[PDB]
C-alpha cells in the first residue's frame, strides 16, 4: 500500500448456524483483499488415537470435496493460485487457520468463499487422497527432525508439565502419519468443523453488503452442530518445586533456570488494560535491573535474563535464565536463586520506573492525537493478531487514551506489588541443561529449596545501581610516517603505495565507491602462523573484534560505530587476517583511527570474554560426544590424516587470561598489511590520513602460512552413527590445476552442466534422495579443482548413490552438447555485465589480482572472459571435475 489507509469500518455478523464473520473495509489500495478463516481446533484437541490429525486435516481439506472431486487446491491451481502465496493453512495447539490471497483480489471473493466453504463444510477426506498426501506430510515430519525441534519438546515437557501440550505436538508421530486411516480424520472433521466453531475475516477493498451476501450464500446452509465443551487449555497449577533436565545428546545447551507459573489474566478486580500495562512496566524495569545484576554472578554463571511467556490461554511462565560453565550447574542455580531472593528483598529502582512510565506516556500521548493510518499489509498484521485472540480491534488513537488513563492510576508501589505477586507464585520449576557427558545428577526438590532457605536467611547487598555510560573517543595521533614509494597502474585507476612501516596501500579510485571508503586490510597472520597458538589466536581475534579498543567496551564500540555509520570487522582465518570496513569519506580519520587502535590498543571486554568462554566450553563438551563431533573427526582423518589444531580441554579453557590472549593478538597485528582501499577522492585527501594512522603501526616481517591441503588418494569410511533416520553421503575429489581467470570460468561452466546432468541421471524417486549438491571450483589459493558431491537420502539405497554419480561423471564429457554451452555462455555474458560497476565484485577481483599477479590487471579485460567458453574447453574441463585417483567417500548411516 503506497497511500496509507485510515482506521477502517468494521462490520460483524453471525449467521443463524453460529458462523461469525468480520468485514473490514479499507479505502485502499484498490482491489487488494485478504481472507482468513479460523476453526477453533488444534492439536491439543486430539484424542490419543488422533496424533497429528488436526494438521493432517488442514492438508486434507484441500483435496476432494463435494463440488471438486479432483481437489479444492486443484481447482484453485486451474484459476491461477499458487500454494503458499495464494492459499495456505497453519495449525497450532489451539486453532487451524486458512488464509487466502486471491490473484485478482476482490474480484475473486466469491470463488474464494466457495473454496473455503468446500474446505470446511464439504471435504471428502478420501483414503485415496490421504495415501497420496502422506508423502507430503511425511516429508514435513522429516524436516521437523533434528536437535532444535527435540530441544523445543524438552522445553515444552518441562515448562508445560501437567498439561495437554507435551503429548500433543502439532506434527504428530511417524506412526500416526503412516497408519492413521481416513476414517479417523473424517470423525475428527465431523466432530470439530462446524459453523459455531468457525470465524471469518475479510480485509480490504470490499463492499460490506455484497461480501456478507456472499457469506450467506456459501455458509448459511452448514448444519448448526455444537462441538464439545473444553476447559483443558491450562497446566494444572499447584504449589510445587518441580526439577527437570532439558536434555539432548546433540545440544550444546548449558543453562540453569528457575520459573514461576501463574494465571496471568487475573487482573484482581482492576482494569485489564491497566494490568497488561503494569506487566509491560514491570518487565521493562526487571530487564533493566537484571542486566546490572551481572556483576554479582560467580564465574560459573553468566547472562542472567528474565523472560515471560504464555503457556496456556491464561497461564504465563516467568523465568530467570543464566548460562552455565559446564560442570558448574550447582553454583549457577544457587547464584540464580540468590538474585531472585534479592528481588524479593528490595523494591525496584524508582528512577527506572519513573523513566519507563514517562517514556510510555510520551508514546501514548502521541498515539492519542494521531489519526491511525497503515499500509495494507500492516492492517492485515494488526487485525489478524487481535482476531486470532477472538477480540475486537481497538485503534491506536483509543489505545493511547486508554494508556494515559491507566498510567494515571499507576504508581511505583503498584509495580512492586505486581512484581512480587509473580515471585510469590507457589508453582515453581528449576531446569538444568548440561552438555555432553558432563557428570550430572538431577537435584532433588529438597536440594533446591535448601538453597532458597539459605538465601532467605542471608544478608544481601542492595540491587546494583546503573553505572555511568562510557563515552569513547579515539586518541589524538600526532606521529606520522611517510609514503616511501608510488607505483601507478593508471589503466586500472590504481596506485600502489609503500609505507615507512612496511605496509602497503593498493588504492583504487573507483567512482562506484560513491561517498564511501571501502577498506580491506590483509596480512599473513592467520591463526596457523607458527608463532601463535591456534585456538588462543582465534579466541583473541574474536574478543578484540567484539570489545574494540582497550579503553572502550563491546557496547560503547557498537554505539560509536552506529553514530558514525561505520563498520570494521576482524576475520582471522587459518592462513590470513582480514580487517574489513566501510565509512563515509568524511569519517576516514575515524575509520583509520579505529583500525589503528585495534592494532596497538586491543581490548578484552570481561563480560564478552566470560560469555565466549561459556560458548567454547559447552561446545567442547557437546562436540566430545556428539554425532557432529564424531563426523568432523572422521572426515578430518579421511581427508587430512590429523587435525591442524583443536579446541582446548575445558580445564585449560578456564585458565585463559586477557594478557595471554592479547599476546596472541599482538602476534597477528605485527604482520605487515596491504590496505585495499576503494575511495573516489584525490590522493591529497587520502595520503595524509594514510601517513598519520596507517604508516605508524609497528610491524615485523612475517612468513606465509602453508595452506591446509587434503591428501591425495582413495579412502572411504562408513559410520552408522546418525540419530535421525537418514543417510549422509559425502564425496571429495581434487585435481591440481593452475589458476587462471579462464580456467576458473570453465570449471564454473562445466560445474553447472555437471550438476544438471548428475541430477537428471539420479532423478529416480526410488533412490530416496532428499537433497543433492554438486559443488566444484578452481580454488585459487590451493590451485586445485575441488569437487564435492553431497547426498542426503533414505538409508536403504545410500550405498548406490555415489556409484550412480560416479558413472554420471564418466559419461559427462561426451554428453555435453553445443546447445548446453551456448546457453551457459549467454547466461555468463548476462551475469558478467550485471557485475560491471558492482563494488563487491570489483573489490574481490582487485584482491584476487594481487594474490596471483601482485598487480591489479584482473580489473581489466573482463569482457574477454566469455570468449574462453567453448564447447571444446567446457568438455575438456568437465573431464577434470572428478578425479578417480583422488576420491574420499564418507557415508553416515543411522545407528544400528
Amino acid at each position: 500500500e503506497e497511500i496509507k489507509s485510515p482506521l477502517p469500518v468494521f462490520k460483524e455478523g453471525t449467521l443463524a448456524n453460529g458462523f461469525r464473520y468480520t468485514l473490514v473495509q479499507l479505502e485502499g489500495p484498490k482491489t487488494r483483499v485478504d481472507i482468513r478463516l479460523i476453526v477453533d481446533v488444534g492439536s491439543i484437541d486430539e484424542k490419543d488415537n488422533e496424533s497429528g490429525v488436526a494438521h493432517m486435516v488442514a492438508h486434507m481439506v484441500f483435496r476432494a470435496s463435494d463440488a471438486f472431486p479432483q481437489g479444492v487446491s486443484t481447482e484453485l491451481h486451474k484459476q491461477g493460485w499458487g500454494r503458499g502465496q495464494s492459499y495456505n493453512a497453519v495449525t497450532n495447539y489451539e486453532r487451524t487457520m486458512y488464509m487466502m490471497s486471491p490473484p485478482k483480489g476482490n474480484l475473486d471473493l466469491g470463488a474464494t468463499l466457495q473454496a473455503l466453504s468446500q474446505m470446511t463444510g464439504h471435504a471428502k477426506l478420501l483414503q485415496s487422497d490421504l495415501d497420496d498426501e502422506r508423502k507430503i506430510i511425511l516429508e514435513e515430519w522429516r524436516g521437523k527432525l533434528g536437535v532444535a525441534e527435540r530441544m523445543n519438546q524438552q522445553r515444552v515437557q518441562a515448562i508445560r508439565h501437567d498439561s495437554r501440550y507435551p503429548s500433543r505436538p502439532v506434527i504428530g508421530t511417524e506412526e500416526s502419519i503412516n497408519d492413521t486411516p481416513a476414517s479417523v480424520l473424517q470423525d475428527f472433521y465431523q466432530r470439530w468443523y462446524h459453523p459455531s466453531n468457525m470465524r471469518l475475516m475479510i480485509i480490504g477493498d470490499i463492499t460490506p453488503a455484497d461480501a456478507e451476501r456472499e457469506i450467506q450464500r456459501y455458509f448459511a446452509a452448514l448444519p448448526n452442530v455444537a462441538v464439545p465443551t473444553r476447559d483443558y487449555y491450562e497446566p494444572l497449577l499447584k504449589p510445587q518445586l518441580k526439577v527437570a533436565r532439558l536434555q539432548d545428546s546433540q545440544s550444546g545447551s548449558s543453562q540453569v533456570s528457575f520459573v514461576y507459573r501463574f494465571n496471568d489474566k487475573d487482573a484482581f478486580g482492576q482494569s485489564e488494560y491497566r494490568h497488561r500495562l503494569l506487566t509491560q512496566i514491570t518487565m521493562s524495569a526487571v530487564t533493566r535491573q537484571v542486566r546490572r545484576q551481572k556483576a554479582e554472578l560467580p564465574q560459573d554463571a553468566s547472562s542472567l535474563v528474565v523472560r515471560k511467556s504464555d503457556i496456556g490461554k491464561t497461564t504465563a511462565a516467568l523465568g530467570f535464565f543464566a548460562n552455565v560453565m559446564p560442570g558448574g550447574h550447582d553454583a549457577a542455580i544457587s547464584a540464580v536463586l540468590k538474585e531472585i531472593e534479592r528481588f524479593k528483598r528490595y523494591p525496584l529502582n524508582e528512577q527506572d520506573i519513573t523513566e519507563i512510565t514517562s517514556d510510555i506516556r510520551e508514546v501514548a500521548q502521541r498515539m492519542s492525537v494521531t489519526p491511525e493510518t497503515r499500509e495494507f499489509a500492516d492492517w492485515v498484521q494488526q487485525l489478524t493478531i487481535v482476531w486470532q485472540q477472538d477480540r475486537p480491534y481497538v485503534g491506536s488513537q483509543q489505545r493511547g487514551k486508554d494508556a494515559l488513563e491507566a498510567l494515571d492510576t499507576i504508581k511505583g508501589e503498584d509495580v512492586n506489588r505486581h512484581w512480587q505477586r509473580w515471585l510469590a507464585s507457589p508453582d515453581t520449576l528449576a531446569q538444568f541443561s548440561v552438555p555432553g557427558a558432563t557428570p550430572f545428577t538431577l537435584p532433588k526438590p529438597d536440594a533446591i529449596s535448601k538453597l532458597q532457605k539459605q538465601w532467605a536467611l542471608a544478608t544481601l547487598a542492595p540491587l546494583r545501581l546503573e553505572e555511568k555510560k562510557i563515552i569513547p573517543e579515539l586518541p589524538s595521533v600526532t606521529q606520522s610516517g611517510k609514503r616511501t614509494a608510488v607505483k601507478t597502474f593508471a589503466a586500472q585507476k590504481v596506485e600502489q603505495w609503500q609505507l615507512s612501516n612496511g605496509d602497503r596501500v593498493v588504492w583504487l579510485r573507483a567512482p562506484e565507491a560513491g561517498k564511501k571508503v571501502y577498506l580491506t586490510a590483509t596480512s599473513q597472520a592467520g591463526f596457523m602462523a607458527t608463532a601463535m597458538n591456534p585456538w588462543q589466536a582465534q579466541l583473541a581475534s574474536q574478543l578484540v573484534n567484539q570489545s574494540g579498543p582497550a579503553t572502550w567496551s563491546g557496547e560503547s564500540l557498537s554505539n560509536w560505530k552506529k553514530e558514525k555509520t561505520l563498520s570494521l570487522s576482524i576475520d582471522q582465518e587459518a592462513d590470513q587476517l582480514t580487517l574489513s570496513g566501510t565509512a563515509p569519506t568524511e569519517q576516514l580519520a575515524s575509520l583509520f583511527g579505529l583500525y589503528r587502535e585495534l592494532n596497538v590498543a586491543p581490548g578484552i571486554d570481561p563480560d564478552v570474554m566470560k560469555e565466549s568462554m561459556m560458548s567454547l566450553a559447552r561446545q567442547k563438551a557437546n562436540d566430545d560426544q556428539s554425532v557432529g563431533g564424531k563426523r568432523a573427526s572422521e572426515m578430518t582423518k579421511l581427508r587430512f590424516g590429523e587435525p591442524a589444531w583443536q579446541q582446548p580441554e575445558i580445564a585449560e579453557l578456564k585458565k585463559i587470561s586477557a594478557p595471554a590472549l592479547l599476546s596472541q593478538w599482538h602476534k597477528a597485528a605485527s604482520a605487515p598489511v596491504t590496505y585495499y582501499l576503494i575511495a573516489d577522492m584525490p590522493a591529497t585527501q587520502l595520503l595524509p590520513q594514510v601517513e598519520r594512522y596507517l604508516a605508524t603501526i609497528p610491524r615485523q616481517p612475517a612468513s606465509e602460512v602453508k595452506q591446509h591441503l587434503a591428501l591425495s588418494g582413495k579412502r572411504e569410511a562408513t559410520s552408522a552413527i546418525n540419530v535421525e533416520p537418514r543417510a549422509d553421503i559425502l564425496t571429495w575429489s581434487f585435481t591440481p590445476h593452475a589458476w587462471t581467470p579462464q580456467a576458473a570460468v570453465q570449471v564454473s561452466i562445466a560445474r553447472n552442466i555437471a550438476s544438471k546432468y548428475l541430477k537428471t541421471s539420479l532423478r529416480d524417486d526410488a533412490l530416496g534422495i532428499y537433497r543433492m549438491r554438486v559443488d566444484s571450483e578452481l580454488e585459487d589459493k590451493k590451485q586445485r579443482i575441488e569437487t564435492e558431491v553431497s547426498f542426503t537420502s533414505a538409508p536403504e539405497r545410500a550405498q548406490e548413490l555415489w556409484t550412480l554419480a560416479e558413472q554420471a561423471f564418466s559419461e559427462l564429457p561426451t554428453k555435453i552438447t553445443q546447445q548446453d554451452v551456448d546457453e551457459q555462455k549467454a547466461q555468463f555474458i548476462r551475469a558478467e555485465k550485471g557485475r560491471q560497476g558492482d563494488l563487491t565484485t570489483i573489490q574481490r577481483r582487485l584482491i584476487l589480482s594481487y594474490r596471483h599477479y601482485n598487480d591489479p590487471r584482473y580489473l581489466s579485460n573482463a569482457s574477454k572472459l566469455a570468449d574462453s567458453i567453448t564447447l571444446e574447453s567446457v568438455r575438456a574441463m568437465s573431464a577434470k571435475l572428478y578425479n578417480p585417483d583422488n576420491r574420499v567417500l564418507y557415508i553416515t548411516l543411522p545407528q544400528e
Binding site: 509491560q280 521493562s284 494508556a403
Partner: peptide, 7 residues
C-alpha cells in the same frame, strides 16, 4: 508482552 510500543 508490550502494550505500548516504545522502540
Amino acid at each position: 508482552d508490550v502494550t505500548i510500543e516504545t522502540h
